[PDB]
C-alpha cells in the first residue's frame, strides 16, 4: 500500500458565504452610468447536480433593501427644506361645479409667509386634500406632520419611473439557478444551471397586489413559510396577467412662489370644469376564473370540503388597508373592499381611490416628502401578477376558511422575484492520494 | 443578429462528472478567476476587486511555499496515512464526484498542509546545501 | 532602453531585447481628493501586473522570456511567408494583422498545456 498524495488545482468545489453585489445595465433609480457591458450573459447548464436551496434566508433581499434605502436617501439630499410651512391656516370650502361624492376633499386655505426678503410677508393660498390637514383647536387647521419630524420637498427634475436592474457577481464567486419549474420555496432542486448575471428586476412598490411583476411557468402556485402556522403571510403567483386601468380624470394646474433666497415653492392653481373622483377599472370574469384556479390549488393542502371564503380587511393602519401604487409619478390609495367579497363551496368593476401628498416612507417617522402637484391628466395601464394572503386559526372542526389582505414589509415583495437565486464561494484548491512519488 | 458555435467546455461543466475524468478541465477555472470587468457603486466595485486580489494572492502564496509552485499538478514524498479514508483506489477515481470527497475529508486539512510544509522544508533545502558541498 | 526598439523591424530588433527586458524589470523599484486617484492608480497597476503573471503562469512558459510549444501554426490566421514577415514588417502591423484570432490561440495553448503534459506526466511517474 505504498501511496503518496497529489495536490490538485482548480477543482470544482463549492461552499457558501455572503458577499457584496454588483450593478449592471433625470432619473435617480439606477444612475445615468452604471456598468456598461456585453448585456447578454449566457446561461450554462450543468449535468448530474442536485442542490439544496432555502427561502426566507436570503442575504440578497437585505442587500437590495439597504441599497434602495441608500439610493433613496441619496436622492433627497440637495433639495429644499420646507420649514416655514408650519403656520395657521384660515380656510374655506370648495363649491364650483363639483360632484357631490367629492364633497369634503379639497379645501381653499390661506396664510402668511416670507419672501426672499427677510423684511416683508405676502398672502399665499392653494388647494389641499382632506387627508393631509388637521384641526388645531374659521377652519384654523394645522399641517399633519407639524407635531412631529420636519418636512422636505422633492426636486422637480427627477421622475419615479422604474428601470430594470441586473445584479451580477464578483469574480471568484458564482450564482446558481433552479431549472425545475415546480419548486416550492424550500427543498432540493434537481436541475441546476448557472449564469453570470441575473434577469431584469423592476423595484416596484405596492402594498397588497403585485404590479408589473413576473409570471409563473405553468399555473398558479402558492408560497408560504409554515402553512400549518396561521401567522405566515402567503405568496400568490398567477399564470395569466390581468390588465388594469387607473387614472386621474381631473385636470391640474400649479403655481410657483419664491419663499427665500434661492428657495421657491410649488402651490396648486385651479381646475377647469368639473371636480371628479379618481378610480380604477378591471375585468370581471377573468377575476372569477383566477379565483377558481386559486381555490383549486388551495384544496390541495387544506380540507377540500372546508368552506373557502374571503373577508374584508381586518382594520388597523391606513397603509396596509388601501392599495398603494406609483402610476404617473404619484401615490394612489385605493378603497379596495369590493374585490375580496366571495364565498366558495366544494364586466367592469369600479374601485374609487384617494391620493395623499405628505408621504411617510417604508417604515420611518424621521422624514417627510412633499411631491409637487403634477399639472394635467394622468393615465396608467399595468399588469397584475401576485397577491398576499393571511389566515386566522381556531381549528373548530374544520369549517369556514376566510382570508384577508396583508403585506406589511417589502422584503416579501423582493422575495417574490428572488425566489430562485443562491450565492456560492469557490474553492480552487484540493488534494487526493495517488500511486506516484516525487523523484530526486 | 447572432449565432452560437460552441467548441470548448463549460465553466464548471464537469462538476457533475467523475474525478479522474473531470481532472482534464482544470484550465477553465483559472482562466476565469480575475475578469468580469472585461458614488456607492464604484465603492463596492473596488471592494470586490480587492477581495478577488486577496484570495488569488493567498492561494498563490500557498502554492509557492510548497515545492509545487508555478506549474499545475505534481508529486511529493509524504506517504499516505490510512487514518483518513481506506478506499481501494477504484471507488474514488471511478465512483465519486468532488463534492462527495470534499465532504468526506473536511476535517483533516491543516495537518496535511503542515506535513507537506514539513517535508518541503526538511531534507530538501538543508539537504541541498549538504549536496552543494563535497 | 525604455521602449527603444520602436521604429525597427521585428527581425532587426531580435537580439537586443534582453537589455529591454532588464530595463522593463522595474517600476515599483527606485521609489483627500488626489489620494483617491492615487489608490485607484495603484489598483490598476497591481491588476495589470497580476494579469500578466497569471497568463504567464498558466502556460509552460513562465520561466524564461522566449520559449517553445507544441502547437502547429494554422495557415488560416495569416498566409505571409517567413522572410516576408521577419524582414518587411513592424510590430504594430503584425498586431493589426493578428488582432482577431488571439483568443483561439490562447485556448489552444491552454489545451496544449493541460493535455499530454500533466496527466501524461502522471502516467510517466508510475513505474
Amino acid at each position, epitope marked *: 500500500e505504498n501511496l503518496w498524495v497529489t495536490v490538485y488545482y482548480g477543482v470544482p468545489v463549492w461552499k457558501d458565504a455572503e458577499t457584496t453585489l454588483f450593478c449592471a445595465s433625470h432619473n435617480v433609480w439606477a444612475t445615468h452610468a452604471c456598468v456598461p457591458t456585453d448585456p447578454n450573459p*449566457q446561461e450554462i447548464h450543468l449535468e448530474n447536480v442536485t442542490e439544496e436551496f432555502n427561502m426566507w434566508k436570503n442575504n440578497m433581499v437585505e442587500q437590495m433593501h439597504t441599497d434602495i434605502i441608500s439610493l433613496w436617501d441619496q436622492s433627497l439630499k440637495p433639495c429644499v427644506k420646507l420649514t416655514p410651512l408650519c403656520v395657521t391656516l384660515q380656510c374655506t370650502n370648495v363649491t364650483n361645479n363639483i360632484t357631490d361624492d367629492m364633497r369634503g376633499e379639497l379645501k381653499n386655505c390661506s396664510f402668511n409667509m416670507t419672501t426672499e426678503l427677510r423684511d416683508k410677508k405676502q398672502k399665499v393660498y392653494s388647494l389641499f386634500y382632506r387627508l393631509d390637514v388637521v384641526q388645531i383647536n374659521n377652519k384654523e387647521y394645522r399641517l399633519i406632520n407639524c407635531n412631529t419630524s420636519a418636512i422636505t420637498q422633492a426636486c422637480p427634475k427627477v421622475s419615479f419611473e422604474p428601470i430594470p436592474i441586473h445584479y451580477c457577481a464578483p469574480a471568484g464567486f458564482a450564482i446558481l439557478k433552479c431549472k425545475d419549474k415546480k419548486f416550492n420555496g424550500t427543498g432540493p432542486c434537481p436541475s441546476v444551471s448557472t449564469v453570470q448575471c441575473t434577469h431584469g428586476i423592476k423595484p416596484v412598490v405596492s402594498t397588497q397586489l403585485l404590479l408589473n411583476g413576473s409570471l409563473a411557468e405553468e399555473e398558479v402556485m402558492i408560497r408560504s413559510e409554515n402553512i400549518t402556522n396561521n401567522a405566515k403571510n402567503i405568496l400568490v403567483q398567477f399564470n395569466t396577467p390581468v390588465q388594469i386601468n387607473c387614472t386621474r380624470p381631473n385636470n391640474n394646474t400649479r403655481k410657483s412662489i419664491r419663499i427665500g433666497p434661492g428657495q421657491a415653492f410649488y402651490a396648486t392653481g385651479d381646475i377647469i370644469g368639473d371636480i371628479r373622483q379618481a378610480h380604477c377599472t378591471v375585468s370581471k370574469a377573468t377575476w372569477n376564473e383566477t379565483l377558481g384556479k386559486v381555490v383549486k390549488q388551495l384544496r390541495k393542502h387544506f380540507g377540500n370540503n372546508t368552506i373557502i371564503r374571503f373577508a374584508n380587511s381586518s382594520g388597523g393602519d391606513l397603509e396596509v388597508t388601501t392599495h398603494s401604487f406609483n402610476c404617473g409619478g404619484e401615490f394612489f390609495y385605493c378603497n379596495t373592499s369590493g374585490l375580496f367579497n366571495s364565498t366558495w363551496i366544494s364586466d367592469s368593476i369600479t374601485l374609487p381611490c384617494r391620493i395623499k401628498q405628505i408621504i411617510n416612507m417604508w417604515q420611518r417617522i424621521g422624514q417627510a416628502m412633499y411631491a409637487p402637484p403634477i399639472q394635467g391628466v394622468i393615465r396608467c395601464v399595468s399588469n397584475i401578477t401576485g397577491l398576499i394572503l393571511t389566515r386566522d386559526g381556531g381549528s373548530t372542526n374544520s369549517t369556514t376558511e376566510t382570508f384577508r389582505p396583508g403585506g406589511g414589509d417589502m422584503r416579501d415583495n423582493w422575495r417574490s422575484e428572488l425566489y430562485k437565486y443562491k450565492v456560492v464561494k469557490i474553492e480552487p484548491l484540493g488534494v487526493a492520494p495517488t500511486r506516484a512519488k516525487r523523484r530526486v | 443578429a*447572432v*449565432g452560437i*458555435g*460552441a*467548441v470548448f*467546455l463549460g465553466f464548471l461543466g464537469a462538476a457533475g462528472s467523475t474525478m479522474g475524468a473531470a481532472s482534464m478541465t482544470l484550465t*477553465v477555472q483559472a482562466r476565469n478567476l480575475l475578469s468580469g470587468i472585461v458614488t456607492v457603486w464604484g465603492i463596492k466595485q473596488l471592494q470586490a476587486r480587492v477581495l478577488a486580489v486577496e484570495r488569488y494572492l493567498r492561494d498563490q502564496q500557498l502554492l509557492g511555499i510548497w515545492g509545487c509552485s508555478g506549474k499545475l499538478i505534481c508529486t511529493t514524498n509524504v506517504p499516505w496515512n490510512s487514518s483518513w479514508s481506506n478506499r481501494n483506489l477504484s471507488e474514488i477515481w471511478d465512483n465519486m464526484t468532488w463534492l462527495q470527497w470534499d465532504k468526506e475529508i473536511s476535517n483533516y486539512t491543516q495537518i496535511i498542509y503542515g506535513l507537506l510544509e514539513e517535508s518541503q522544508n526538511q531534507q530538501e533545502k538543508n539537504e541541498q546545501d549538504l549536496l552543494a558541498l563535497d | 532602453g525604455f521602449l527603444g526598439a520602436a521604429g525597427s523591424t521585428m527581425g532587426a530588433a531580435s537580439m537586443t531585447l534582453t537589455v529591454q527586458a532588464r530595463n522593463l524589470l522595474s517600476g515599483i523599484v527606485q521609489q483627500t481628493v488626489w489620494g483617491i486617484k492615487q489608490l485607484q492608480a495603484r489598483v490598476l497597476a497591481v491588476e495589470r501586473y497580476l494579469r500578466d503573471q497569471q497568463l504567464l503562469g498558466i502556460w509552460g512558459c513562465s520561466g524564461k522570456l522566449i520559449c517553445t510549444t507544441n502547437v502547429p501554426w494554422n495557415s488560416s490566421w495569416s498566409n505571409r511567408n517567413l522572410s516576408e514577415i521577419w524582414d518587411n514588417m513592424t510590430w504594430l502591423q503584425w498586431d493589426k494583422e493578428i488582432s482577431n484570432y488571439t*483568443q483561439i490561440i490562447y485556448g489552444l495553448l491552454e489545451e496544449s498545456q493541460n493535455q499530454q503534459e500533466k496527466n501524461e506526466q502522471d502516467l510517466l511517474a508510475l513505474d
Partner: antibody
Amino acid sequence: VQLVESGGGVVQPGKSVRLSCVVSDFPFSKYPMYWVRQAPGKGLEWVAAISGDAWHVVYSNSVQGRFLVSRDNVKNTLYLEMNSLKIEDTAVYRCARMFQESGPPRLDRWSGRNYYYYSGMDVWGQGTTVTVSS
Amino acid sequence: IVMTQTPLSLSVTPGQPASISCKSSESLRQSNGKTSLYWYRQKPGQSPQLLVFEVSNRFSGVSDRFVGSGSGTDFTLRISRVEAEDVGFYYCMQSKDFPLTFGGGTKVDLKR
C-alpha cells in the same frame, strides 16, 4: 457589380429543383448572403441566410424541414434547393447581399461559444420567379 | 418581433417637406452602440435600392435630401424638395433579431 438571379420555371406540387446565383466584383470568401421573398402584389419576406464561411445557417418559421442551401467559395456560386413544394409558395425569389463586411468570429473565454454578427443589405439584383402551379 | 409602418400612404405635391415614420415594437439598442433600422426604396417593376443605414446616415452616392432620424421608441424620416423621381414604395426593415420583418407599404405619387 455583377449579381444575377437565374432559375424561373413552373411546377406541380411535390418536386425538387436546384437554383443558382452568379456573383462577381467582391472577395466572395468574406461576405454573407441572404434570400428574400416577394409575394405577387405584396410586400417582402425573409427566408434564409447562410454564414460567411459557410458553416452556420438559419431559416424562416415555415420551411424548417424543407430547404437546403450551400455555398461554393471555389466557383463563387450559390446553390439553393426547395423541396416538397406548394402552389401557395409562389412568389419572387431573389439573391441579394448584406451591405456591411463581417469579419472573423469571436471566441469568448467564457464557455467558448463562437459568435457571429449580421446586418442588413444594400444591393438587390433583378430577380426570378417560379410559379408552383397545378 | 413585429414592426408597423405609420401612416399607410400619401399623395404629395412639390415644394414641401416630407416625414415618414415607422413605429417599432421594441427598443433595439445594439451592444455595439446603435440601433438596427434601415430604409431602402424600390420602384415599380424594378429592384430595391438602399436609402439609409445607421439610423441617421445617408448612403454613399445619394442626394442630400435623404437622411435618417429617430431612436428606439419610434422613428421617422426626413425628405425636403419633393420631386417626381421620389415615388415608389418605401420600406422600413428590422435587422436586429431573427426572423427579420419589413415595412408594409407606402404608396407615393403626385396629386390630381
